[PDB]
Chain A
Amino acid sequence: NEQELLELDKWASL
């Protein structure tokens, strides 16, 4: 998972 940090963005449409 090279973009795992993105899993922490809870403030998007998805």
Chain B
Amino acid sequence: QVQLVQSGAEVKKPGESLKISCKVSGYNFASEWIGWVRQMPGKGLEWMGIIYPGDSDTKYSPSFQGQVIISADKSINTAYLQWSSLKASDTAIYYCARQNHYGSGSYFYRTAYYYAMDVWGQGTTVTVSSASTKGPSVFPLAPSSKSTSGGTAALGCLVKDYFPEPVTVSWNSGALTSGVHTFPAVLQSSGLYSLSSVVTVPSSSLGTQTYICNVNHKPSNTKVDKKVEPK
């Protein structure tokens, strides 16, 4: 199983430098190109560049050359992306992905392989802002014994006043996925984010089953578990 494990989400002020990493396992890191892909909020994919860890040969998009450096330490299976001075427009999700090669070719001359990004990291969320990191407050969205519709009830957790993105929300340590909706975060006028996660359950499960929302905000190293019950 090939796995790319990217560094955690970060917030950094404009002008600051930043280096993020992607740690690889499951194949020979020195033997395939690996690269970086930018995704700005609400936008498509942008190929930034690739590096071949074996000799650290690099190829950049000209839109990113001289603006970022891609490097690698093959002794610890890690690829890096760096900035010298972040701009506000660098706010995005950065993916690190193996640019695998396909097809068969001769050892005795260069071959035009088919290259594709076959395994992707989970992505690193980078936020360029002067605002400081803040952990979330988590509140229950309590189901009621009466606001029950069609034999189903809804409950959830409100995750409020955190910065930067993202938070992740699981239910019962990932055992509960069916009927779960976690909403896109909204930026409040305070400049802090807020979102909700909800789950629909049979009304009969109110009080008898256990619903706990697990909220992770890695930028603050915070993790909150909230039990939700009818009130």
CB distance from B134 to the nearest CB of A (A): 44
Total contacting residues, chain A, CB less than 8 A = 11
Docked complex Cα distance between A3 and B110 (Å): 10
Docked complex Cα distance between A9 and B101 (Å): 9
A12 and B59: CB pair below 8 A? no
The A interface, classified by DSSP as helix, strand, loop or mixed, is loop
CB-defined contacts of A8 to chain B, threshold 8 Å? 33, 52, 59, 101, 113, 115
Q: Does B102 contact A (CB under 8 A)?
A: no
Q: Does B183 contact A (CB under 8 A)?
A: no
A6: contacting residue among B33, B52, B108, B110, CB under 8 A: B110
A5 and B109: CB pair below 8 A? no
B107: contacting residue among A3, A5, A6, A12, CB under 8 A: A12
A6 and B54: CB pair below 8 A? no
Docked complex Cα distance between A8 and B101 (Å): 9
A9: contacting residue among B54, B55, B59, B105, CB under 8 A: B105
B33 and A12: CB pair below 8 A? no
CB distance from B34 to the nearest CB of A (A): 12
Q: Given A10-B54, A10-B55, does the pair A5, B108 have CB atoms closer than 8 Å?
A: no
* Extra pairs beyond A3-B112, A8-B33 (10, CB < 8 Å): A6-B110, A6-B112, A8-B101, A9-B101, A10-B57, A11-B105, A12-B105, A12-B111, A14-B109, A14-B110
Interface residues of B (CB under 8 A from A): 31, 33, 52, 54-55, 57, 59, 101, 105-113, 115
